[PDB]
Design a protein around this ligand. Sequence first.
Ligand SMILES: COC1=C(OC)C(=O)C(C/C=C(\C)CC/C=C(\C)CC/C=C(\C)CC/C=C(\C)CC/C=C(\C)CC/C=C(/C)CC/C=C(\C)CC/C=C(\C)CCC=C(C)C)=C(C)C1=O
Lengths: 96, 341, 100, 173, 49, 117, 315, 66, 174
Amino acid sequence: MIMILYWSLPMILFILGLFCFVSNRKHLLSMLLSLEFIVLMLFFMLFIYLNMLNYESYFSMMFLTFSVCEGALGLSILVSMIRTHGNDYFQSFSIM
Amino acid sequence: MFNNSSKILFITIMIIGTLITVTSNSWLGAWMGLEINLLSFIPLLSDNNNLMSTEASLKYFLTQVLASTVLLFSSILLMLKNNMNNEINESFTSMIIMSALLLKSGAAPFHFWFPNMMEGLTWMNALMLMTWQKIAPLMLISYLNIKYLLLISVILSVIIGAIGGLNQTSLRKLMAFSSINHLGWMLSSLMISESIWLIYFFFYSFLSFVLTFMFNIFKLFHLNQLFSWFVNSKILKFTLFMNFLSLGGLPPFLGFLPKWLVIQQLTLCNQYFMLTLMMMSTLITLFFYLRICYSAFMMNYFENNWIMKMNMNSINYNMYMIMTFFSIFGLFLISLFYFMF
Amino acid sequence: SLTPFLRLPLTDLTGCLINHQTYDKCGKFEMKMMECFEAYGLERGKRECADLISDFQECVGMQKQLMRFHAMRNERYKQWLKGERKGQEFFADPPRVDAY
Amino acid sequence: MIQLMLYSLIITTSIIFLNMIHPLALGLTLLIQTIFVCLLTGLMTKSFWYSYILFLIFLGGMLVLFIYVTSLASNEMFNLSMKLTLFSSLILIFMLILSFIMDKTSSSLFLMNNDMQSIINMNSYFMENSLSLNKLYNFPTNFITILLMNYLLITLIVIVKITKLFKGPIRMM
Amino acid sequence: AKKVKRDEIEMRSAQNVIFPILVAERDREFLRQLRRNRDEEAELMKNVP
Amino acid sequence: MFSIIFIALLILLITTIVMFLASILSKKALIDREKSSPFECGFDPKSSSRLPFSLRFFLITIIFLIFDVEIALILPMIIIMKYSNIMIWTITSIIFILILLIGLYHEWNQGMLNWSN
Amino acid sequence: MFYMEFILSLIGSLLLIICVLVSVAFLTLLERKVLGYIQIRKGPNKVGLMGIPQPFCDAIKLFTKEQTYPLLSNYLSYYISPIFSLFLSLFVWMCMPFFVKLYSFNLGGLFFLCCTSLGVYTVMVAGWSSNSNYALLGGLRAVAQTISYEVSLALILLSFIFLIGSYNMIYFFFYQVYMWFLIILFPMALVWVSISLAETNRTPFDFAEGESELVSGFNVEYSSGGFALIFMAEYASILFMSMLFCVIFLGCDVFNLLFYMKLTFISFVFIWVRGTLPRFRYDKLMYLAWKCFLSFSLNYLLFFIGFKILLFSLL
Amino acid sequence: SLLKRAWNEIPDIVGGSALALAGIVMATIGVANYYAKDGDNRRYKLGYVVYRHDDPRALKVRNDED
Amino acid sequence: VITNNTTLPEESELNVQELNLSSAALRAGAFHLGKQCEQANNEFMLCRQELDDPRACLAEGKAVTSCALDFFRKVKKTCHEEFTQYATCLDKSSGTMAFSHCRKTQGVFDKCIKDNFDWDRPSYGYFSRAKVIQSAREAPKKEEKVSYPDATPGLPEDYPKPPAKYGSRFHWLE
Ligand SMILES: COC1=C(OC)C(=O)C(C/C=C(\C)CC/C=C(\C)CC/C=C(\C)CC/C=C(\C)CC/C=C(\C)CC/C=C(/C)CC/C=C(\C)CC/C=C(\C)CCC=C(C)C)=C(C)C1=O
């Protein structure tokens, strides 16, 4: 099928990104590491679709701007994490 | 909008973010508005005086980031096969979009994060989360037309939303499970129309807007505090708590009219079996509301006696009393409303 | 394309985000189709736009042609692996570079 | 041809990335992949302008998280996994073998490279990225860029307020 | 800036005298190829259902 | 590209050979428990280097991520000046650089650009 | 024909590689002689004939000297970091404009930005891999350098780019045919050299090495093989960045001989400055980039956006 | 005063903003001058542009000398 | 997409004498060549834009190539030596085949062609301008508007709106 010969690989890569975002690693940063991994794969598919259009790749910039802000915001929340808990370990948070 | 000029901004940018989503004529445009909305809420939500608040700022962020990420994943996939923002005949690719949106709003199967982040929010924060943040997600689900997936969330929402709430004593955590149930009614109202949903949402926000103030004005966070709460006229305290009954949708009060119009339309559309599970499950929701009214309906209590006085903010209380008055006598104004016909 | 319920002035902001109307092989194909959606509305348009949607999708998505192409290649390989072809004459003469 | 080998490597590096635990091991895996994805994207496009931008953008994020990794997760451990090295090396050669015996006219992506375009296409004889990036700064889509600007500036107000610089440095107490 | 533009326009003007020539050539060979492909398709798949 | 990748590999091979010569050409002597000890001015070290190293430019560190992503939006300017509407291009570009300056001066005046103190 | 074409491209890169690798050896001698004459010293004068074979006389030692295997270092990372430091130094040369084509490189200006940023990881990884207190301080002193110069670097490149119309470096030749952009861009030339120093981590911005603050910075735990490549990779950066100053502000007549008389002179300037200025203070640089340079660079984008617009109307 | 303090403390932002202010001014001259010449209609066109004698655009052909 | 019923011209018709003349040789005569075959070029290029069917412009294309081949026969007859020197220079002077380098040899040719055929080199920007012609094809594309008589009708503003019968008609007329 068309979807299997052309769009399978990025999707299989995407789900592997999510399975990193949920696996049990001690440090919160392990979530941030896997966060921009997924974003890297989202860019890849979005770039497939935008190129089916002849001239629409400019929207890649729009996507990248929101990619950094969620990473940048994701990093700020970690900073605020440290200065109330002292450490970023997942097991240090109240389970609720 | 409580402390500094900065809080004023984040509130507005939240409004802009939500509006961009619900006014967008394409999935990609809609997704952008969600990102705008995301960072407008977190700074409002994070305060370092509380060890709990920063934890709340986390669980929301990880959940919402995943939701928008998976949401964008499917939207790209959706128009990779159809080449349109719309799918002619709904299929799996459209289901995936629905799953993300439900998690974005904390519907039943993916609600877990939602109560578990309510421990560390101020009351004014919970209102923004409970009411406004549910606009953009639920409003996009109106575009998608999958029945069984949406139908399953309703059945689980009313059930999990009710049974879970019986065991809580923290009002903030209790209202979360209460809000999950009202969310179930919306999604049921969303497979039939939107004008009902728009009406029903406005009333739901109205009641929650009221109950939040009463706790917010008197800083109550636990059931025991209700019994210890001091009021000059036990008649006054008795009447303030009569808003819970409206939140329970009892017909003598305004809070039933929303439930009522959702049944006159679901029944018109032959969804009889759904209403049985929903309306029946609402009783359990009505139950723990009465557990709160134990502190009002009985009206002579053993209370601590180092308080003789009520210290309350005027403007909040001034607006709260006005809102409460309609919440008890708002039924006879159904004549005026012309949005149901 | 989706229809916002709100349709406040904000929709003007993001309306023209992604389109096919800028120098595209399918610019005319989509304008007809989407026009027909505007004439009949969205829900009824999905039942009157059978040709326009299929043509537009076969102009952008191109699945209909790519999925012809593999049938030719696979059927070329199937013949050879069955011995029906030969190694010397496996492919036809290539096109000229200065073409297409 | 290298496109298929790029497919193999991006798959291979993703398998191991699922198994990294040490944050820097994750980072090295991610950095390597950011190279390949950047390379791969430019194959199926009229220019590599976006690969340059994407590469530049992520490298900014690469440095910053090392600074925080070296402050938060400084003391952690690696473990060479003989299961992993064999598994990746086993499939990697296996995948590389296929790419040599693949009908790699069929595997090529249908997206039109610049040369894949016709000779008659008059719009393909301008500067490499003129038209594509054009309407990023023309009516009406320009307002989207403007909307980002506030969004980025408003973000810049969010970090300082979340961060609360004055109440000290950051240490992994 | 004038001199660079002067030179550029001269280079571009040379294209417009050559560009029509190539298009004439390509069409007369683009068409010829299409016949061969329409004929290769016939032979390749005689026995397909 | 494909030319550059080949030379990229060829260079990497060449530079790799250089130490592979150095590793053999290097004089070889028995390694001592002290020869491989770290250098910290001749006195044994108190603290591993893998302890948490405090940070003071964390705030700038985040601002650096942002400011780059606006470099993605100024760079295309030149390329599309001959091809764009001059009012839209002129107006938008200016209100792009004013926004950046205003943001910078705002934080500079608020003292966020200064390090943690 | 075409098959032959890429063969020549290989030869050019190899020819450019060996020539650059040789020059950085002789640059190090030049650094010692010139820095030995600004100081009233004589400089290397004995070895061989008049000191010319001095740098070769040192390349012998740094390779007949044993590798160091630090006890507490992740050896594989510690062992590989020198390779990529040298590779990235040589690799960035493939974009240097030639009228006798070597590589097309439309968007060559960006390719500069990508490659130069990569040079920080090699320092960064080497310092952390060494697992010594000083080495780590050197690495994190280098990263903070990037946070400063990186953003201002792009903006200042953008100003030059507006003048030429494209990111292809070849166009610098045509526009610098009557005069030199140095005249139009005098403060940027002066600023650009300042940022160029940060790129190569030189005095007054010598923080990665950090000599006399850190014992030897991130190099403190390297020896014969690894340290040599770190050194060569350092001076390859100077040589290129000096050339990149000659193509931007000084004519860019790559095929003329004088261009190489100019190239060495800017190399002399880099040594000249090292013998004049004391090192900045680790924070004063980061404040300098954000407080002054970034604001400065943005101000002229308006000046050149207006000037290009005004010039566009006339032409 | 104010002018003095900045001119003494941060002279670059004053000089830099002085040229920045120059950009806006002579950008406002050039942009107005551009539509004072009808520069949208450019005598040299990218690509091979051919009009019919009856097309409305055929009237607006900018007639120049070289 | 091509099927049997789609009509492509037979192979013999597409055959026609071709230039087969390298790039540098073409760029040499560009300015003098352009002034001659402009009538054919514009006629050919005009149809190709309005009408995007390659087989439709088949007749015009043969005119364009014939004019090009016609021009070089003249050059072959007279300035053969000069043209080769100009082309050789233009080819071997830079990697772009820019005119800015070979101005000298160019002059030699321009004087040969203006002494043998009294032609003039057009100004540098002559061919970059918009070229308006008298369409000999005489079939400018038509204009039409689609018609949907079955469109979803709406309530027209002229429609009168009397009071509702018994009002809301809800439950107890409220
Ligand atoms: C007392 O107060 C003072 C201080 O306080 C302590 C100071 O710190 C200082 C500090 C001084 C400085 C920082 C000065 C700058 C110097 C340094 C940072 C380091 C010192 C080293 C140098 C100057 C030497 C420069 C060169 C290197 C380090 C090596 C670089 C690599 C090189 C040259 C190899 C290049 C590669 C090539 C292929 C070139 C061609 C061929 C060869 C080399 C091959 C050689 C031989 C063979 C292959 C053998 C073949 C044989 C056969 C076939 C038979 C001063 C001055 C001071 O006064």
